[PDB]
A paper describes a structure:
N-Acetylglucosamine 2-epimerases (AGEs; EC 5.1.3.8) catalyze the reversible epimerization of N-acetylmannosamine (ManNAc) to N-acetylglucosamine (GlcNAc) in both eukary­otic and prokaryotic cells. The reaction follows a deprotonation/reprotonation mechanism involving two key residues, which had been thought to be histidines, but which have recently been identified as a glutamine and an arginine. AGE activity is greatly enhanced by the presence of nucleotides, in particular ATP, which serve as allosteric activators.
In this study, we report the determination of the crystal structure of the AGE from the local strain Nostoc sp. KVJ10, which we refer to as nAGE10. In contrast to the pAGE and AnaAGE crystals, which both belonged to space group P212121, the nAGE10 crystal belonged to space group P42212. The structure of the monomer was resolved for the amino-acid sequence from Tyr3 to Leu391, with residues 157–164 missing. The fold is that of an (α/α)6 barrel, with the helices connected by small loops at one end (the back) and long loops at the other end (the front). Gel filtration showed that nAGE10 was present as a dimer, and a melting temperature of 72.3°C was determined by DSC. The nAGE10 dimer, which involves the front faces of each monomer, differs from the back-to-back association presented for AnaAGE and pAGE. A comparison of the assembly parameters calculated by the PISA method indicates that the front-to-front organization is more favourable than the back-to-back organization in terms of interface area, number of interactions and solvation energy. One of the principal consequences of the front-to-front dimer is for the ATP-binding site. Independently of which site is used, the localization of the ATP-binding site at the dimer interface is the determinant of its role in AGE activity, which may involve the oligomeric state of the enzyme.
Residue numbers in the entry:
A (entry chain A), B (entry chain A): 3 to 156, 165 to 392
């Protein structure tokens, strides 16, 4: 039960390893923004700017500045992204691009709303960290675009996706200081009700990625799809929100679901959770289904640490230890820093990178910070 | 040098194994069209109708009826698809859907032109096999939509894809009997010139998937991408077209390129060709890059058999044998019929299916038929 050693492990990994890696290798001080396409050793292999990741990195450094320590270098790193993004990130109608060239010329315009999501979250927390009022309105613009486009984010077979209420819930938390208290309260209750009613299958105790509007299943590739890590991440989002109202019943239901997903999705031959599974045991359409991904395992560490902190349930601690041994031994790279993102089913490195189009300065530092928080809270009552 | 035994191997695999599998398990005689989502044993795991594959299956049975033997059952199988597709396959503007429900209700409308491509090819050959004149105009409609939309199939970084002239070349061959002789001649010469000028890198002797309009490379994920099997398939397309004009120089250049790609893309640890590679040795964005796919290896068998038949070059025969031993021992399923589509890098079955959203009655029977043709021609001068 060495909670204090775990707290120290996560604190040291965040401050001395992971943040250091991004500080040393990712800053584009000449043109603004960040290089995310970094190989195992931190070498740059592509200079394109993927806006999700640009915004996530602004958020991470702004958050840590605001909540942990006002280190000048963290704020300067956040500014290097925020200024670049404010100048180049949006089309004439204020919609966020998906990708730019190094110098900020637009490459890709997205159909989704997740670009706007990450922009709202980043500029909200940058506004707070930097005391930059202009960033508040950038954030508010991006946020109303998400709620406006929520119901069709992009007749025969109506379906809706878990990702939409998920990101809108967690985002609303990040927008709290800028929103009417009632608006916050309502969206939070509604998104939580939708996630726990429609996407949670009461009979199987599992989260589905896509359901009909009334929560019923549809027998098709989309309607059979399970993404173990995605559902686990949603559940700690739900825990975090339920904790605010001390809704212990909802916290415990979320923990039930996390344990169900882990028991369902663990690879008994090689260890780790599968990336995708078909709920009915049919062959998935995803060629990457059996792969072992960094964030799937990190968000599981967060959910189990948070579940144990919030409920004290022994099963969370037992699963925490099992997940810890697997994730730390397979993804963490002690020699060069940071975590590998992509392993094959056997746990072998599949892409020799620390960042890319979809991995940047976000899931790893956020998860390490959150786990540090849970174990520190466990060791030291507030 | 047992050419006759190879001819017999391919003939028997096509007629007694592969066509039999699709005849036994894939026909939707109640509603029309075909079930492609078939597991290892032929069991159906999804009833959706993926229009690419519906059209490809109409083409395969129509082609064999027209070129091999007028078996009544083959034409009835082709009709079961063609009638279903004519009734349900197109929107009000005559554009082909990407997917329908079992009964033909539209699910997905595609942005690309490859749906129209496969529809033009299918209805062209169905028109010929069935003597159905109405199918000619369905085909001609679909074909002019492809040429009309060829230049933007769906300012900062202009790029074009190999798939477009590739499919337009091979398609033009399948439309020959319906087109002005001059129109055929021109498109064929132009598509061949574009493929062999712009997408073929003269210095590396390799095919690139995406280049700038003038054929120059762009240093980005798309511009570094190699798809070994895709380039090999394009090269036998080029061989087939060059053979028509007895353009021996072009035939031999295409064979040069096939041999270059095989030497570049062969997995020296586990055997087989990689699905995707980054030309500059950076980490790919494709999580499926190291996988071993049925059509990648089948189109390589076709290209090597055809290359050897057309040129007699010993290297083609040596690579044929190497590829044959790998592909037949890893993909062919003697117990239940047909070929697995999807193996991991080690050659282990990754998806336990014989068909799905992207694998249907096309690459396997076409490749087995073409290889039968090459070895029969080698054994028996015409
Ligand atoms: Cl990330
Ligand atoms: Cl196919």
């Amino acid at each position: 039960y060495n909670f204090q050693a775990l707290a120290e492990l996560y604190k040291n990994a965040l401050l001395n390893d992971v943040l250091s890696f991004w500080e040393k290798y990712s800053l584009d001080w000449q043109q603004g923004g960040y290089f995310t396409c970094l190989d195992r050793e931190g070498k740059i292999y592509d200079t394109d700017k993927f806006i999700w990741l640009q915004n996530r990195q602004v958020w991470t450094f702004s958050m840590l500045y605001n909540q942990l320590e006002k280190r000048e270098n963290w704020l300067k790193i956040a500014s290097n992204g925020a200024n670049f993004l404010a100048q180049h990130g949006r089309d004439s109608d204020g919609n966020w691009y998906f990708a730019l060239t190094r110098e900020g010329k637009p490459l890709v315009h997205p159909y989704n709303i997740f670009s706007d999501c990450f922009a709202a979250m980043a500029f909200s927390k940058y506004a707070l960290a930097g005391g930059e009022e202009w960033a508040k309105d950038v954030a508010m613009q991006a946020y109303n675009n998400v709620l406006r486009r929520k119901d069709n984010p992009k007749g025969t077979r109506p379906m809706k996706s878990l990702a939409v209420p998920m990101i809108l819930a967690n985002l609303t938390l990040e927008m709290e200081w800028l929103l009417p208290k009632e608006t916050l309260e309502n969206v939070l209750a509604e998104t939580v009700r939708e996630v726990m009613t429609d996407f949670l299958d009461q009979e199987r105790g599992l989260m589905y990625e896509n359901v009909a509007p009334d929560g019923s299943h549809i027998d098709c590739f989309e309607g059979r799809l399970i993404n173990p890590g995605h559902g686990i991440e949603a559940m700690w989002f739900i825990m975090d929100i339920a904790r605010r109202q001390n809704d212990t019943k909802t916290i415990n239901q979320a923990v039930d679901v996390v344990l169900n997903i882990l028991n369902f999705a663990w690879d008994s031959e090689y260890g780790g959770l599968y990336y995708f599974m078909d709920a009915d045991g049919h062959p998935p359409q995803q060629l990457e289904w059996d792969q072992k991904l960094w964030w799937v395992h990190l968000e599981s560490l967060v959910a189990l640490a948070m579940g144990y902190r919030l409920t004290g349930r022994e099963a969370c601690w037992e699963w925490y230890q099992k997940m810890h041994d697997y994730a730390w031994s397979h993804f963490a790279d002690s020699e060069y820093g940071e975590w590998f993102g992509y392993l094959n089913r056997r746990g072998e490195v599949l892409l020799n990178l620390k960042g890319g189009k979809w991995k940047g300065c976000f899931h790893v530092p956020r998860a390490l910070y959150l786990c540090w928080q849970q174990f520190e809270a466990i060791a030291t009552p507030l």
